Each structure stands twice: as C-alpha cells, then as structure tokens.
C-alpha cells in the first residue's frame, strides 16, 4: 500500500528548480517580492489591495518547439498549462525515466484559478481560442507523453494539489495505474484575484504568511508549479529507483456545516489527521515534523494547532516532541500549488535528514500555547535527529471552503556520458547546467546510468568518455567555451569508443545491455525561455 | 461492488425537473433555441468560415435562486456563481427524491461535481469597487457538503466534456473503498457569457445549424447546452436493506486517456475501445448482453465515425452478431451539456432502464452515410418504444463520454429487478408546496408510500400544515382548499393517535414518524424553491 516518491520537479519564487528551492529553504530565504510590473502595476490599486506576492521568474516563457507546438498555439495556451507540461517532463527526468521506460500512467493536477481566461476574454481582436477550462493542464501531459491512465484536473481551492495526490495514490493502490504524476500549478497573471480576495480581507497587510507568528492578519498569494512521480514502493525498490520518501497514508474530508463556509474546523482537521494516522498504522508520538497549512491568519493559526493537538492527544501526552513549520513562510500561499510545495519540502527534509527554518515566528503568536502541545516551531535549519524509529512527517492542506487533506510520509531506508538536446544551443546550455551541478559528491556510475537510460536520445548529441568527475567537468567546460578538438568527445546529429561513435552518428544503443547503478538526480532539460502571450 | 442509483434530480433545456426531462425525451422534443436576450444578443455576433452560433440548449431561470432557504444573504447570492446556486438546489432535490434528509442520510457522504466553465468569473471581472468575483470551482461541491453537513470528500473535477462521468467514477471508487457510505455525483454547465461561443466558434466546434445530429447526415459540430444534475449513489446491498427505491444499478465504470494522437483534440478509437473493454471486464459482462448504448454522440464528422469504430471494436472481441444493440444520445435532444453531458446521459440511461423504455434519438432519419450500421452491433433508435426483454437476461446499457482533450469514460448500468405533514420555510412556499403536491396526485399514487416519504424523507420546516386524509381524493380536495386560501379545513392542523400526533407536530414538536412502522420510498415532489433573480 505504501507509495514511493521517485521524482520531483518544480518552480517556485526565487527557485528555477527543486534544487534551488532546497537551497533557499536551508538558507531561510524570504522569497516574497512586490508585484512585478510585467504582471500589473500595483500602484494602480493603492487606494488596501496587496502589493506583494511570491512570483516565479519567466512565468510567460515556454519552449513550444521542444514539444512541436506552434508559436501561435503557445500564445493561446494558459501559461499554467505550459509550465505544468515542462514540470512533468522534468519530474520524469528527475526520476531517471523516459516516457518509454516509465501505458497506465495517471496525471492528476490541482488547479484553482484561470487568470489567462480573464486576460483572453479582455482581448476578445477577431475571435481566437481563449483557455476556458482546466483539463488541458493534465491532458496535455498525458497527450505528449503518450500516457493512457486517468488524466484529471481537480479543484478544492487551497488543498487542490493534496487532493490530487490523494486521488493518484488511490488510483495506484487499486491498480488502475502503475505509476502517476501528481501535483499542482498556480499563476497570478491578472489583478482580479488580488482585488477580489482583498475585498474579503484574505490578504495580509505586510505581504507575508507569518506562520504561527505574532501579527499575522492574512496570507500572501504565491505562484508555484510542481509534481511528484509516484509508484508502489515494492516496484520502485525492484526497479532500483531512487526513493526520496514513502507515503504511508493520505486522507481527505470536509468540514461540513460550520458557522460560515470559509471558517476552518478544528474538529474536522483532527478528524482527517486521525484518519490518516490510522491508515498509516502509526502513532502520532512517532511523528517528529509536521508541515502545517500555516497561512498566518489570526483565526486559522490557533485552529490548526487545536486540530493537530486533538489528533495527537488520542495517542500521547508528551509535549514538544514534534517540530512544525510551513513553506508558506518562505514562498507564500501557492494556492492550488500549496500542497505540492509543502509535500516537496517535506520529502526533501526526509531525504536530506534536515529540518529547515520556518520564517516570521521569532515572535510567536502570543495566544498559541506551544508548551502545552506536541509541537515547537522550527526556528533554525538543523540536522533532523534520529528519532528514538524512522523519521516521519505529517503534511496538512486545508481548503478555504472546507476540503481538508493530510498525508503522512516516512524516510526511505535502503564511463560514457551521452548528452543530447533538440539543437546545438540547447546542448551547450545542457552541458553548462550539468557542469555546474558537479561536485565531489557526484557519483559517476549513477550519473552515467541515469543519463544513458533516463534521458531521451535527442537530435543533437555529445558523448563524453571520462575517467572521473573532474575529467567530466573539464570536458564540459571545454565544450561550453567552444573548444574545437576535444579528445574523448564525439558529436553528431561493448567497446566504449565504438559505442560512442555509433551513438553520435544517430544509432540507438541499448545501454542496459552493458549492465544496475541506482538512479540519481541529474539536471533536467534546459528548456528555452521564450516569451509567449496573447 | 455494485452501486445503486437511489435519487436523481436536474434541470435541462425545457425541463424544470427530471420528470419533465423524461416526458420531453419520450416525446422526441427538440429542446434547442436561439440565445435568449437575457444572456447576450446573438445579433451582435451574426456577422463575425463559420458564423458564431446563435443556438443553445438553455435552461429556464438560470439566474434564479432561493437564498433565504439556505440562510444566504441577497448580497452573497449575487456574488455566487449561478452554477453553484443551481447545483446546491439540485443536490437538495436529489436527496429529497431518494426519500432522505441530510440527517437520515448522514458524516461520510461525498460530493463530486464535474465542471468545465466559469463564465460568471468573466462577468465578474468585467464589472471589477472591489467585490468577490467567483474565481474557483470548488465551492460548487463544497457548498453542498457545507449546507448538508457532509464530511466526505468534496471535489470539483474538470476533464472537459467527460467531467461528470469522471465525477461519477471517482464517487464510485470512493464508495467501493469505504471512504464514503454514499455520495452525490453530477455536474453543471451554464452558458452565461459569449466568450465561449466566440472562442469555440473560432476553432469550428459549433455546428452551423445549432444541432447535435447524432449519427445523422450533415453533422458539422455541436451545439452547446446547459444542464445541472446529480445522482445519489449507495452500495446496492445497503440500498436494498434500507428499502430504497433503486432506479438502476451501476455495474462498472472506467476512465482513461487517449495518449499521443495526431492532435490533442482528435478522438481515438483505440482508446475508446480500451475504456469500453475495461468497463465491460469490471462489470463482468459480455458486450452481446448490452442492448442499449448512450453514445457521446456529438454529431461531428470526425467524432461520430470514430465513436462507432471504437464501440464496434470493443464489442467485437465479444461477438459477431449484428444490429442487436440500440444506440442514441441525449445530445440530439438538449445539445452538448459540456461538463453536464455525462450526468444528462446517465440520467437518460437510468430513466430508460427504470421505465423499460427506449426513446427516440433525433436528427438521424437520414443516417450519416459513412457509418455502416449494418456491419456493426448497432442500430439507431428512431422511435420511442418499449425496451423488449433481452433473451432471459437483464436490460443493460453502456454510457460514454469523451473529453475534447482526451479523457474518456464509460459506465455500464443494469436494470434493478394517513397523515401528510407538509412544511416549508414560510407560508408562501407552503402554499406553493401544496399546489405542486396536488398537481402530482393521480390514481397511480399510493397514499401509504406518499405519507411515509413526506414524514421521513422531508425536513420538518418552520411553517406547517398537516392533513389527516382517508385517500388521495380526500387529500387532493384539502390541498386545493388550502391553496385557494381557506384557513380552516377539517383534518388540517397548521402552525409554526393520529389526531394528537398532528396537533403536536403543528405546534412545533418533532415527531419520530418511524416509530409508527416500511412502505417503499417513491418520488414525491421536492421543495418549491423560490425563483428570485440574483446577479452582480
């Protein structure tokens, strides 16, 4: 029943990749900025409407030619769709798979806004296709990758990307798919959301999510796109996959009748948490980190603690044994991508055995009584100490109109470099991106296995024959700086040299015949960053 | 693993209820009209190589709601997407049609809504002093869970045209694994803003005559339709043991995606055949035993032949017999209800099973000449007629819904083989209730079933009128006297041993009517929601 997380990718505020996301989390970086001019001018509305957001870079950019999509079609495609496509491609690559090697594969996308529909409608020049639905966000992935499993967009507002994961997990567990991509996307492209949520008081007056901190009076909207590739644990183990973390349980529910549709319910939150702990078969005493929903609201924050404390109580009376935090303190409330950002953070912490700082709570919310609870707020990045049993994390996401989700994760306890891209420019970018990732911790055999068997063999090719990582780094740099005659590099459009020669010429090599090293994260395809808009 | 359909409700073009829907289906009524002026003026776009469509299937009173019933303010009702308003009333109806209240039905009851458009967001954004624009789907499902106090999964899903079948599929799976004990599933679609028409017109999706000519000659696109609907689903064994009224049984559902096809909006016969085979295998039945299929059936020149090719391929493993299975589509009647297309099709298929009647499929008197029905399992249903006993085995129907961007669904369904305490929120609604109830009475109604259902399957609301009645004729006379404004009537107690029970109830006590007993549940008219207009 357990599900392995075998691949992850995404883009978040100040993070072009999960790797940059992780560095920013460890550093405690506040990633919120003012609304960029290229989206709208916040000064237009200063008479207050929030001027802050977590924004991703290059939200309007895409590489349609990679996918054989025309420029015209790219312009009409919702950026959310464009970015989720790239992200899913990257997630599969992070896992060390190609669509071929990975067809009952599901795609489950959380999404709650369609800003590009508003933008398209304003522009309705002669008629053109406005992006009016969600489904293509998921369906485009299934289409391009030739996947036949369920392909669904779901909206539960703030919990949407956990709902998406829950549905992917259940689909895998009943055998409807063998693996699935699950995640979410959220882009802030048009000011209507800021005006509208401002009119209801949802946005904080300082532009921060002060997770369990003093003075919190709302949230700050954030952008994000992210996915995880999920597979049954046992299969992932047999296939020699790299497993970031194991999902032991997920549960969803609704608040039912409470005083107002947007009032969160401690009882219903405790309910979903207990249901998930029971599905996972674990005691709450064994959970040593929780990734809270954590939006920084004066009503919300105390309720979230009350719901967690009630759930944990049927099960222990020990106090302050579990750390808590939220990624919202770093990047804001990514809305439909809130669950996927939180799950990505949780899985990284587990994989890296590191708990990161939760921001904006140096002064705690004075009403929360953490001393009388299971929890303390993580105030510095530090090693995650061996619990004493495995490191286990809970993860919560609570939709504004009542749909709740909780997931429990557990830590997982266990040459020829053929690079290719669509063209020469993308290949040089690939080589530079690969070179920069290399350090004394890179494992050559795993790097090579993953590039050989977990990347598509594309049009423009550069194969390197290398002794070790230092030799690889030197060759990539020589290639990048345009050096002409590089020994041990073959270029084009079981003897190593011959294999190389043949691959550079365009032949298919069955690299598997040579063997398995374990799969390992390698930088993913360097999509061109070209702008497309209506 | 079989799932009972125990309650259904909905509104569709020319149909204020499922019962009007059924009558229109039997009659072969073409429900398509020109765009009503109250939505937009189609003449605005008549000169914008296909012209912007001036046709749709439109429901009446799309902009109406009874917010006071739900204790929603007028201001909140204006800001609420009409899709959310109507789905709320429709789920209320569905539960009432099943003979339940939220209390007697329920915690773990799921709500799963298919949705693919948010025209009210466009309308809201045009009008943007700040106010809340309806920018998400989730409240469509979540408001139902909220109001009814349900704690199960509450999800909106979008797989475009297949959305409501995807919704049903998810509800079934949820019930089968024990996450919900019952679930509402359905969909909603409203055509409130012209962007979709301009947009879908630009790509040629809309037909030039404003019809879905399901398997008929000359079909060149579809006509957009409005609809809202839901079904209440429950495990068959539990529905039997609770004495529910079962319209039909769902034996299997399956969903998939087309994967890589020549263009994202091109349908795939292989993938359609695979979803149909997967569903038949889940249901455990041979395709030779399917005697009706509710086709996706949009009337497009590419779509229609592909659908027949997919169905033929799936049925062929199973059999070589020809023309043993009738086929048709509700889209020929009401248009392509988009996110609500699956729920309208499922509702038609369940009705046909329950009533043992196959209805006419429109606009195919001339068949699409490329189809070759003679070499296939199928013939198009051209008249409404009795559904003949298949031979002995049950009447079984397949039901298909194929999303424009590739998400497919198929479902297989099988046939399933005194004191009147009326109440409403206020006096005006109670008079309307009595009039609606009176009109539904005929020599076919059975008093003991009617009384059981009003007693145990309706909430005891604020304004009350209890009648003590000897038979249906006595009931009808009393309701008519009440409606014409008589305040005092023998055997009527009003307020805010039969006689004492009545007295007590009229005074405001709650009475446990079950103690008196079970008659089978039946459909009785549902709450007469006020039709008041709310807009931004």
Tab-separated table of C-alpha atoms in Angstrom, chain A residues 49 73 81 112-114 117-118 121 124 127-130 132-136 139-140 142-144 146-157 163 166-167 170 174 176 190 192-193 195-197 199-200 252-261 279 401-403, chain B residues 48 52 76 116-118 121-122 125 128 130-133 135-139 142-143 145-147 149-160 166 169-170 173 177 179 193 195-196 198-200 202-203 255-264 282 405-407:
chain	number	residue	atom	x	y	z
A	49	UNK	CA	-5.071	45.775	-2.234
A	73	UNK	CA	-0.713	27.622	-30.176
A	81	UNK	CA	-0.617	24.519	-18.879
A	112	UNK	CA	-7.860	26.771	-8.677
A	113	UNK	CA	-7.524	29.890	-10.855
A	114	UNK	CA	-7.685	30.640	-14.560
A	117	UNK	CA	-9.110	33.176	-19.227
A	118	UNK	CA	-9.732	36.724	-17.933
A	121	UNK	CA	-11.637	37.435	-22.572
A	124	UNK	CA	-11.747	39.251	-27.448
A	127	UNK	CA	-12.070	35.577	-32.253
A	128	UNK	CA	-9.344	33.244	-31.126
A	129	UNK	CA	-9.314	30.309	-28.716
A	130	UNK	CA	-9.458	31.585	-25.094
A	132	UNK	CA	-11.513	28.486	-20.692
A	133	UNK	CA	-11.040	25.118	-18.882
A	134	UNK	CA	-8.649	23.304	-16.555
A	135	UNK	CA	-8.480	19.877	-18.113
A	136	UNK	CA	-5.760	20.582	-20.661
A	139	UNK	CA	-4.460	16.234	-20.587
A	140	UNK	CA	-1.530	17.880	-22.374
A	142	UNK	CA	-0.928	12.594	-20.984
A	143	UNK	CA	-1.048	13.548	-24.669
A	144	UNK	CA	2.601	14.460	-25.116
A	146	UNK	CA	1.580	9.014	-24.513
A	147	UNK	CA	0.062	8.093	-21.178
A	148	UNK	CA	-3.302	6.354	-21.051
A	149	UNK	CA	-4.136	6.457	-17.350
A	150	UNK	CA	-6.603	8.783	-15.715
A	151	UNK	CA	-5.883	12.426	-16.660
A	152	UNK	CA	-7.762	14.799	-14.306
A	153	UNK	CA	-7.715	18.374	-13.050
A	154	UNK	CA	-9.176	18.880	-9.586
A	155	UNK	CA	-10.156	21.970	-7.635
A	156	UNK	CA	-10.581	22.023	-3.892
A	157	UNK	CA	-9.116	25.515	-3.741
A	163	UNK	CA	-6.470	16.185	-3.201
A	166	UNK	CA	-4.668	11.521	-2.729
A	167	UNK	CA	-6.537	10.592	-5.902
A	170	UNK	CA	-5.825	5.687	-4.505
A	174	UNK	CA	-6.341	-0.174	-6.773
A	176	UNK	CA	-5.866	1.490	-12.154
A	190	UNK	CA	-4.314	39.157	-13.652
A	192	UNK	CA	-8.868	40.376	-10.426
A	193	UNK	CA	-7.816	37.861	-7.783
A	195	UNK	CA	-8.963	42.834	-5.836
A	196	UNK	CA	-11.424	40.139	-5.078
A	197	UNK	CA	-9.541	38.403	-2.217
A	199	UNK	CA	-12.308	42.828	-0.775
A	200	UNK	CA	-12.876	39.887	1.568
A	252	UNK	CA	-9.349	13.840	2.749
A	253	UNK	CA	-12.635	15.170	4.221
A	254	UNK	CA	-14.832	18.150	4.507
A	255	UNK	CA	-15.751	20.422	7.426
A	256	UNK	CA	-19.498	20.129	6.908
A	257	UNK	CA	-21.769	22.693	8.492
A	258	UNK	CA	-19.734	25.249	10.397
A	259	UNK	CA	-20.704	28.854	11.014
A	260	UNK	CA	-19.577	30.098	7.600
A	261	UNK	CA	-18.208	28.195	4.553
A	279	UNK	CA	-4.315	4.444	7.525
A	401	UNK	CA	-14.198	26.347	1.526
A	402	UNK	CA	-13.759	23.250	3.632
A	403	UNK	CA	-11.948	20.455	1.831
B	48	UNK	CA	-18.412	37.757	-37.171
B	52	UNK	CA	-20.700	32.440	-34.341
B	76	UNK	CA	-23.900	36.724	-1.165
B	116	UNK	CA	-15.522	22.973	-17.119
B	117	UNK	CA	-16.549	26.636	-17.470
B	118	UNK	CA	-16.742	29.691	-15.178
B	121	UNK	CA	-15.886	34.817	-13.463
B	122	UNK	CA	-15.707	36.713	-16.849
B	125	UNK	CA	-14.167	40.548	-13.845
B	128	UNK	CA	-14.424	44.978	-11.477
B	130	UNK	CA	-13.840	45.610	-5.259
B	131	UNK	CA	-16.187	42.701	-4.610
B	132	UNK	CA	-15.688	38.970	-4.543
B	133	UNK	CA	-15.553	37.521	-8.096
B	135	UNK	CA	-12.845	32.605	-9.412
B	136	UNK	CA	-12.767	28.863	-8.476
B	137	UNK	CA	-14.773	25.677	-8.962
B	138	UNK	CA	-14.506	24.143	-5.522
B	139	UNK	CA	-17.460	25.921	-3.916
B	142	UNK	CA	-18.076	22.405	-1.116
B	143	UNK	CA	-21.283	24.421	-0.611
B	145	UNK	CA	-21.080	19.494	1.824
B	146	UNK	CA	-21.281	22.666	3.952
B	147	UNK	CA	-25.019	23.124	3.895
B	149	UNK	CA	-23.243	18.814	6.945
B	150	UNK	CA	-21.415	16.160	4.973
B	151	UNK	CA	-17.860	15.184	5.823
B	152	UNK	CA	-16.813	13.001	2.945
B	153	UNK	CA	-14.659	14.062	0.002
B	154	UNK	CA	-15.947	17.266	-1.634
B	155	UNK	CA	-14.358	17.711	-5.046
B	156	UNK	CA	-14.803	19.577	-8.308
B	157	UNK	CA	-13.244	17.865	-11.311
B	158	UNK	CA	-12.579	19.001	-14.895
B	159	UNK	CA	-11.961	16.650	-17.749
B	160	UNK	CA	-13.932	18.912	-20.034
B	166	UNK	CA	-15.195	11.371	-14.235
B	169	UNK	CA	-16.280	7.357	-11.450
B	170	UNK	CA	-14.486	8.984	-8.522
B	173	UNK	CA	-14.370	4.348	-6.286
B	177	UNK	CA	-13.114	1.553	-0.793
B	179	UNK	CA	-14.246	6.351	2.151
B	193	UNK	CA	-21.089	34.886	-21.339
B	195	UNK	CA	-16.625	34.331	-24.867
B	196	UNK	CA	-17.061	30.610	-25.110
B	198	UNK	CA	-16.611	33.193	-29.926
B	199	UNK	CA	-13.797	31.054	-28.748
B	200	UNK	CA	-15.289	27.624	-29.684
B	202	UNK	CA	-13.002	30.257	-33.847
B	203	UNK	CA	-11.945	26.620	-33.788
B	255	UNK	CA	-11.710	6.131	-17.321
B	256	UNK	CA	-8.549	6.541	-19.474
B	257	UNK	CA	-6.797	8.956	-21.734
B	258	UNK	CA	-6.073	8.883	-25.468
B	259	UNK	CA	-2.311	9.470	-25.065
B	260	UNK	CA	-0.470	10.657	-28.152
B	261	UNK	CA	-2.872	11.144	-31.107
B	262	UNK	CA	-2.384	13.406	-34.074
B	263	UNK	CA	-3.663	16.487	-32.268
B	264	UNK	CA	-4.831	16.947	-28.703
B	282	UNK	CA	-15.084	-4.683	-14.459
B	405	UNK	CA	-8.704	16.885	-24.919
B	406	UNK	CA	-8.626	13.148	-24.391
B	407	UNK	CA	-10.093	11.940	-21.112
